[PDB]
Design a protein around this nucleic acid. Structure first.
Ligand SMILES: [Mn+2]
Ligand SMILES: [Mn+2]
Ligand SMILES: [Mn+2]
Ligand SMILES: [Mn+2]
Ligand SMILES: [Mn+2]
Ligand SMILES: [Mn+2]
Ligand SMILES: [Mn+2]
Ligand SMILES: [Mn+2]
Ligand SMILES: [Mn+2]
Ligand SMILES: [Mn+2]
Ligand SMILES: [Mn+2]
Lengths: 99, 94, 107, 83, 98, 79, 106, 94
DNA sequence: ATCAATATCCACCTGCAGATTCTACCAAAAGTGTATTTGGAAACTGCTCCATCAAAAGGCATGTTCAGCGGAATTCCGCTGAACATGCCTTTTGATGGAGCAGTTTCCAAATACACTTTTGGTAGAATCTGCAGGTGGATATTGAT
DNA sequence: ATCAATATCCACCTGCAGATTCTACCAAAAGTGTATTTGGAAACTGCTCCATCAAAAGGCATGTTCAGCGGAATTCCGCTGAACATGCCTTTTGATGGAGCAGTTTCCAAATACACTTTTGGTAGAATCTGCAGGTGGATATTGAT
């Protein structure tokens, strides 16, 4: 009776759901502190327009999503279905982010 | 205060292709970004092209070559027609 | 006194574009044909994106084009995708695409 | 107050979601720390340029336009925030 | 007689070509390729000799960097032999192949 | 054909300078397609600059401007 | 009448840089110091590369700097390599580099 | 006729740095491409900064920020150091 | 471990393709004093919007157990690519003219530009009007155990 | 294939956050007027670009042989997905204080443009000058058989 989906089934269901929507996936306040912390380490006493924080969040989430697509292609190239740090690294080396 | 935008023109064009379709403000913001972006890219190419040829004037001819270097095949061909058309029509008038 | 836009048969503002070309330091001079041609290309490009986006709106039973529709229109069109290949549309999400080997079963 | 360790606000679940939107089905346990480091670098580079635009304009407030110009310099053009 | 093992001469060649700078594609053949392709865009064109050289230097530097990325993709798969799929993966990721 | 003038041995040499030790047989035709796509893209833009200048001679500078536009800046041929 | 470069303590032509800034349509006006700063910056970068290329020349027992030496100086220097990240130096070749896994099992 | 280039100046700097070292024509050509390339990038950025801030003048201040935006860390420090040094030396010379 | 076939190195030598130097020559520039005009900093200030804090509440993060199945080590072998010798086709190198067509110079008519000066097509804020977000319920599609 | 635990698609329904019209000012276009001038159009010169010819030699192509790489198959440890229980912290809603930005006004250090004078930078001839690419000799290292 304790119903159970096999591993991978819920993951596939998750890909379809997130590929269908457009909302930001990282919690807002936590992302804002991160931005504030990194900025503060460059220059103290900075204020931020709220649309500035959001622009950084849309830019960041698009960048990570596309990095994951490339990472995924690198895992599959290796005959795997699991992404690993080495896949992320190969992708960034080829994209020139650290060639 | 005051700040310009292509919103009314984008809107006029929206009504022409889709009479019953509206547009959210965020999407209009994106359409505005798009127009300014392509404006800069084309003007930028026109600028270099002129300098390369030691020309001090940017004419419809520079905008045209700029469009051929900037847009992919088919969008280029159509943009050119629309551009040539508007210039010719503009010239026949007055 | 007719507008330069109506003389050109355009919806986009010719004079505004003219002025924008002057103030941008692109060259010492701006021919009169330049803004006309540029305003026309811009209007053509926006007409092209709006046709496809309004369509994506219709396919999702919507009457209002939102960023998700602009993204679907651009990413699904070979040429627009390439023209905007290094651009990100806020709130556009991505195209539904799952790699084959990830799918279950066999056959 | 003092801001420290906020990179951890980028949770394992949030990183899963992002990978899902990216079409990823299975994730090794080391992916999360790797992703955090990649995101920190991404933000340091963008925030660094946005802040440089801010200081040049002699202001104390990072505007959406500072970020948009920073993003563009880095060939990461963004539509929807003024540019 | 004498015979070097598979791979030994390959290594030798990498060391030799990574040490020099001359172009590796014969010139005349390259020049025909350039003219042929140009002809499809505008007929009866002429080329400054330096124009063809610029194109050859650009093309070889491009192909050589692509091969390094291709090698990285083959090694990622646990191989030491580059294949069509390696070049494709590298191009897709670079943004040249979508 | 001319594209075939770009020989297997020459493609090997390129690969070698690229640090490649072993090559698959399908690599040569795949490499040719890539080079043709590369030359078409660059030559197309250069000739576009040639025509704009109203010339019949593709200049080194035309090639240099074309490469710069494609984000493949080249030093040594002017500009 | 002395040269603006000597006043700045530069070898690079402050005057030409000044004129180049005006003819480039970068802005309506150019401050007086703009060309000085720019020229100094261009000379410094020029010296930074000549220095490393010169060394590359010497390590190879040659006294004449050739493109190969400019390629070695730029690619072997983390910062210069990034600045010229999307630049191709004609006749520069590449850096000797063989992935370890390709070395023969000793 | 008449092709202007940075060659004689590059050679002058080559002498302060390595008095006994020479340079081939091809190498000189590459250095000239370098100076023009860096000139265009720096000037291009300063141009944009002025426009962003509704200014009509490109002063050493724009050239400085442009340098910080374009040069990797250390290179920027010394470049900005050399620029500041050259303007001071120049601002006090009757 | 012992030869043996080759590849790799170093010191030395020197003709010349390419670099440095004298040299002169001329126009293209660059530098200074002078008159006119203005871009933009300090000084004041109206008023948007940014940082903070309090308060409630449930959407989600965290941490744990459990076991499916993915990743990776190990073994086996078919066959694709590397090495190499043989034959020889084509690229390369260099003298030659014939000419196409960039680069220069002169003429001049179509076409910009800044100041004027009149006029309306945009923009911001207030007024007016509706697509759809979000909640509910039920018919259909999908999964996974047996 | 049969049956149950669940996720998923889908159309009707409806208050509200956000979109689509109405007003009135004000930057900001647009007919004319001169005056100025880009740069197209033509006659003209000569720098290189193309076609032709011709041997030497250096690659390229082909065929043979087999070492060893790639991938198929089998196996198992253990990582990572799925599900659950607990409650923390992000989200949603506003109210307050003011930091700082953006509009307006005032005014001088600084910039554009001649107009005029001087020389520095480009070029090239023809001559002057030389670093280093090849090519040789002999020594030692690398590789791979047995
Ligand atoms: Mn329609
Ligand atoms: Mn003023
Ligand atoms: Mn498996
Ligand atoms: Mn004829
Ligand atoms: Mn009106
Ligand atoms: Mn709904
Ligand atoms: Mn329900
Ligand atoms: Mn194996
Ligand atoms: Mn908890
Ligand atoms: Mn030698
Ligand atoms: Mn010998």
């Amino acid at each position: 009776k304790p119903h159970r989906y096999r591993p991978g089934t819920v993951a596939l269901r998750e890909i379809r759901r997130y590929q269908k929507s457009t909302e930001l996936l990282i919690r807002k306040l936590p992302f804002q502190r991160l931005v504030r912390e990194i900025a503060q380490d460059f220059k103290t006493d900075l204020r931020f327009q709220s649309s500035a924080v959001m622009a950084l969040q849309e830019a960041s989430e698009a960048y990570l999503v596309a990095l994951f697509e490339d990472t995924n292609l690198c895992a599959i190239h290796a005959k795997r279905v699991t992404i690993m740090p080495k896949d992320i690294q190969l992708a960034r080396r080829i994209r020139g982010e650290r060639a | 205060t005051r700040k310009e935008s292509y919103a009314i023109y984008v809107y006029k064009v929206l009504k022409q292709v889709h009479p019953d379709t509206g547009i959210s403000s965020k999407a209009m913001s994106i359409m505005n970004s798009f127009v300014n972006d392509v404006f800069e890219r084309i003007a930028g190419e026109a600028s270099r092209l002129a300098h390369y040829n030691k020309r001090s004037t940017i004419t419809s001819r520079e905008i045209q070559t700029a469009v051929r270097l900037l847009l992919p095949g088919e969008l280029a061909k159509h943009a050119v027609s629309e551009g040539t058309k508007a210039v010719t029509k503009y010239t026949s008038a007055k | 006194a007719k507008t330069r836009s109506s003389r050109a048969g355009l919806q986009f503002p010719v004079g505004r574009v003219h002025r924008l070309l002057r103030k941008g330091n692109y060259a010492e001079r701006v021919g009169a044909g330049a803004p006309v041609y540029l305003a026309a290309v811009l209007e053509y490009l926006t007409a092209e994106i709006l046709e496809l986006a309004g369509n994506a709106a219709r396919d999702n039973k919507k009457t209002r084009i939102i960023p998700r529709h602009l993204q679907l229109a651009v990413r699904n069109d070979e040429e627009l995708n390439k023209l905007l290949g290094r651009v990100t549309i806020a709130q556009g999400g991505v195209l539904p695409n799952i790699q084959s080997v990830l799918l279950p079963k066999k056959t | 107050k003092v801001l420290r360790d906020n990179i951890q606000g980028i949770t394992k679940p949030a990183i899963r979601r992002l990978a899902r939107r990216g079409g990823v089905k299975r994730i090794s346990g080391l992916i999360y720390e790797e992703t955090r480091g990649v995101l920190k670098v991404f933000l340091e580079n963008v925030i660094r340029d946005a802040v440089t635009y801010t200081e040049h304009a002699k202001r104390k407030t990072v505007t959406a336009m500072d970020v948009v110009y920073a993003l563009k310099r880095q060939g990461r053009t963004l539509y929807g925030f003024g540019g």
